[PDB]
A paper describes a structure:
Cyclodipeptide synthases (CDPSs) are enzymes that use sequentially two aminoacyl-tRNAs (aa-tRNAs) to catalyze the formation of two peptide bonds leading to the production of various cyclodipeptides. CDPSs are built around a Rossmann fold similar to the catalytic domain of the two class Ic aminoacyl-tRNA synthetases (aaRSs), TyrRS and TrpRS. Overall, the data show that the first aa-tRNA binds the enzyme with its aminoacyl moiety accommodated in a P1 pocket. Here, we study the binding of E. coli phenylalanyl-tRNAPhe (Phe-tRNAPhe) to the XYP-CDPS from Candidatus Glomeribacter gigasporarum (Cglo-CDPS) by gel filtration and electrophoretic mobility shift assay.
Moreover, we showed that the replacement of the conserved catalytic serine residue S32 by an alanine (Cglo-CDPS-S32A) inactivated the enzyme. Therefore, this variant allows formation of a CDPS:aa-tRNA complex without further reaction. The 5.0 Å resolution structure of the Cglo-CDPS-S32A:Phe-tRNAPhe complex shows a Phe-tRNAPhe molecule bound to a monomer of Cglo-CDPS. To avoid overfitting, the protein was refined as a polyalanine model with only a few side chains modeled for residues visible in the electron density. The structure shows that Cglo-CDPS approaches Phe-tRNAPhe from the major groove of the acceptor stem via the β2 and β7 strands of the first half of the Rossmann fold. The CCA arm is bent and located in a channel delineated by the two catalytic loops CL1 and CL2. This contributes to the positioning of the aminoacyl group in the catalytic pocket of the enzyme. Comparison of the structure of free tRNAPhe with that of Phe-tRNAPhe bound to Cglo-CDPS (rmsd = 3.8 Å for 1611 atoms compared), highlights the bending of the aminoacylated CCA end of Phe-tRNAPhe that accompanies the positioning of the aminoacylated terminal adenosine 76 in the catalytic pocket. In the final steps of the refinement procedure, weak residual density was visible in the active site at the position expected for the phenylalanyl moiety. The binding mode allows positioning of the esterified phenylalanine within the catalytic pocket close to the catalytic serine residue.
Numbering used by the authors: 9 to 69, 75 to 268
Write the structure that this text describes.
Amino acid sequence: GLEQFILENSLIKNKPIKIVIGISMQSPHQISNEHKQSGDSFRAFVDLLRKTNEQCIRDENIRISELIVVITDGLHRHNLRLYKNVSTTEAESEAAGLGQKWVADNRQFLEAIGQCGISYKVIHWEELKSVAFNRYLQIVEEEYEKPNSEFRSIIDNLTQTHLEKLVNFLLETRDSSFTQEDCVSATRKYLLEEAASAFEFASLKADGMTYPGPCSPGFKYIYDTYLSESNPLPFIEYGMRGGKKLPSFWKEESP
RNA sequence: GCCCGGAUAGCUCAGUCGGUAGAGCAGGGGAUUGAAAAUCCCCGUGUCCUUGGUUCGAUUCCGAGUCCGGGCACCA
Ligand SMILES: *C(=O)[C@@H](N)Cc1ccccc1
């Protein structure tokens, strides 16, 4: 899908539109192979990008160029560390490794986006979370140091979400020996890292970042404070499905 | 993955069983001016996206393909 009704609110046209995007992954995959940024999702992002490179007499009176792609490869760490003792950094290593696994599971789409005209970047875990996280976490806690801000409401909502998720997860294996306070606090840590990912990402990348869903968790609270007056955080919503196979160039298995 | 709409003059779209599809823009020709600029008037051979059927005949009715959207399922 798209948001043509949202293109005029910013009112910056007749030029290349710097865009970004960030994918995620859950520990226990309920939909298994089906997930965000599947093959259909990447091909549909490419198609929605190419839809603005056509109709030059109807878009001048929408363009897609210079794009980037982020990955929260270092977000769901403690989510996977519950299965085995392992280590604190080993859980990171493995989760970011699966992130890079997907990054290689659809590299053809990333490279073919460059043939369609759009640039291709590849942000990762450390590539973003490697600078200015002390002041970021400090500001997150400064917003979460009072029950008046809706940051506590979003905290409780995401906490209930991750709590149901971790309850269903540990309901299969009770050998984790984790704590309810531990699950809640690790979920809140991931949530605050996602909230602090508005400051660091909005400052690291120019203009806007688009996700298929809404993704207003933490991003709204932080970006309305800082990014909305430094680098406008505009979230565009995408949405596709499966019905008729589109034309995919070099759509074959590697050999 | 499942389910629901459209494509018509060059372009926008309006056309409701199946009863020779027309309003706006554009564009050509005019009268009048010395000439243009306003105003009036004339001007559409459209397989209604191709290709198989009912009919007396199908725009929209049934079958096959091409291209634009929607509603769900999965939220994280
Ligand atoms: C899921 O765990 C999300 N918090 C991860 C995420 C999604 C989109 C953008 C940034 C982070």
